[PDB]
From a paper:
AusE (Mr 35,100 protein, 314 amino acids) and [name] (Mr 35,121 protein, 314 amino acids) are very similar (~78% amino acid sequence identity) αKG oxygenases that both accept preaustinoid A1 (5) as a substrate to form divergent products through dynamic skeletal rearrangement. Non-heme iron and α-ketoglutarate (αKG; also called 2-oxoglutarate)-dependent dioxygenases are widely distributed in nature, and play a major role in diversifying the molecular scaffold. This superfamily of enzymes employs αKG as a co-substrate and Fe(II) as a cofactor to couple substrate oxidation to concomitant decarboxylation of αKG to form succinate and CO2. AusE first desaturates at C1–C2 to form preaustinoid A2 (6), followed by rearrangement leading to the formation of the spiro-lactone in preaustinoid A3 (7). In contrast, [name] first desaturates at C5–C6 to form berkeleyone B, followed by rearrangement of the A/B-ring to form the cycloheptadiene moiety in berkeleydione.
Next, crystallization of [name] required replacement of the C-terminal region (Glu295-Val301) with the corresponding AusE residues (Ile295-Ser296-Ser297-Ala298). This C-terminal region plays an important role in intermonomer interactions and [name] failed to crystallize without this replacement. EDTA-treated [name] crystallized well under anaerobic conditions, and we succeeded in solving four X-ray crystal structures of [name] at 2.1–2.3 Å resolution in the apo-form, in complex with Fe(II) ([name]-Fe), in complex with Fe(II) and αKG ([name]-Fe/αKG), and in complex with Fe(II), αKG, and the substrate preaustinoid A1 (5) ([name]-Fe/αKG/5). The loop and hairpin regions are highly disordered in the absence of substrate.
Residue numbers in the entry:
A (entry chain A): -2 to 63, 65 to 274, 276 to 295
B (entry chain B): -3 to 268, 279 to 296
Write the structure that this text describes.
Amino acid sequence: LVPRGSHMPPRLQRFPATASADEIFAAFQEDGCVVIEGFISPEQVARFSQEVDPAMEKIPVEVTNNNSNDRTKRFSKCVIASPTFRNEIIESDLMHELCDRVFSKPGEGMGYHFNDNMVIEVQPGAPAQRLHRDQELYPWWNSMGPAGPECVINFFCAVTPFTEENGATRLVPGSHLWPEFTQINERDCPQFGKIETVPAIMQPGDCYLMSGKVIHGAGHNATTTDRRRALALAIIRRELRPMQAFSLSVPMKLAREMSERSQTMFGFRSSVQHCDDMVHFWGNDGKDIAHHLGLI
Amino acid sequence: GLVPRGSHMPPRLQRFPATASADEIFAAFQEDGCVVIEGFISPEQVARFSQEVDPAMEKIPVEVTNNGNSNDRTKRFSKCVIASPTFRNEIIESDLMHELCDRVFSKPGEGMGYHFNDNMVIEVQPGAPAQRLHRDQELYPWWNSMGPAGPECVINFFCAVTPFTEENGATRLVPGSHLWPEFTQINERDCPQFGKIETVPAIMQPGDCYLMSGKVIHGAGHNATTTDRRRALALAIIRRELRPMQAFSLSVPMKLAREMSERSQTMFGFRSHFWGNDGKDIAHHLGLIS
């Protein structure tokens, strides 16, 4: 708390992973983003960081003369690398309940799947990325405005601490409700230069859940020694294409050891949509693709 | 000229030979939302395709349900690559199809902006009820909310494998419905025009197709015949950002994938930055790049 008269920056609500999902969903609806403390346990986060570390050592640091991949290591093969990720982290019931509240329709099953599973290590000195919305990946989505449905949501987990100085993500709460969704540039955004943000200060295992409609951007890692790690669990709706071809690069040995909802998340199993007709997305001539892969 | 002077002029489908300019076909497609391409598939290849899928079509039982869904007295079959050499080696390698797909979907400097949604043999059986009027892009349920200012979602190259007649269940198209100001469900509750919606049959010979926008209202007609099984081949093509209805890269044998050109590998998801592999083309891991 600050002296009376100080300006108050935007509110980023926070809940323990033990709070009711409806009370966390309620804050997600208000602000577009919410911090879930203890989403991952400190021992699970430590084990995951250690389990992906040898792959992360082999990634070189990309340094360039301009970007968002400037001094940032990126690694997406978490299912292959980390048993704690594939056995425990993706199996968070709180994650899946919130995904259902966002994405799933009645009588249709899982309305969502994985877009990506990226580990990020932001090096000391890495610059701050432009303000943007994640749904800009699906370029038509902004044109539907705040009345549009959700494209994507992110559970952005802290693996090491997120501080203001080591570059914690800067969010714009309530930007999912602005009347018009433009790109954030001088030409297109009238608020440009005048958009107040709030960092997502978190401890390891905390995550923020962020709508694809919310304006955000990574902060500058101003430190001397802090290599800030994050795990982005990016989840899209059933009808959108994933940025990783998990079902073609994850081995069937790991597919056979997954639960049915994890197979669905990675495309080892289909989902049934109802269109006036029950339609399989990602199916096989009227059957679940899981039959053919030997998973039923 | 076309209609007797003074009469109401109904909707009509422009027709082009397959040797016409893709620019001339695409102008028609933009004006009306659909266009016939005569001879999209050659007579010899159409015949070889039908014969190659016939055993797959024979092992498909005929439902007689009266439940109003799209499978009542309608056979549907999506394993054309696996079943037909002519399909995978010849029919999908039409330069005109890709030139048209490139004008609908591709942006400069980003490669192919499209891939396959489905490859479906649709054989309407004698007696089949008419299907509901719909837009194909209702499969991506938010798209209608964007209106005619929205971008293109899906297009289908709907090819006649056997003749399409007014009497055997030819599709009834509503040209220009891609420009109506509000895209709603086509039913009594939601559509003010319901019951006063002008359609046209797509009359076609084996090898003809119509290219149709996902924004166009259409529906199969009733097969009033007693023996005419109206066989069609629907090549559905979507933006690269959208999920296919078939998991073609998990069901098509790698043996067939290695015989595809690069562009057909891309159509089926054997080649990729969507659908990638941790920063690299998935075709590397699959062993398809040399």
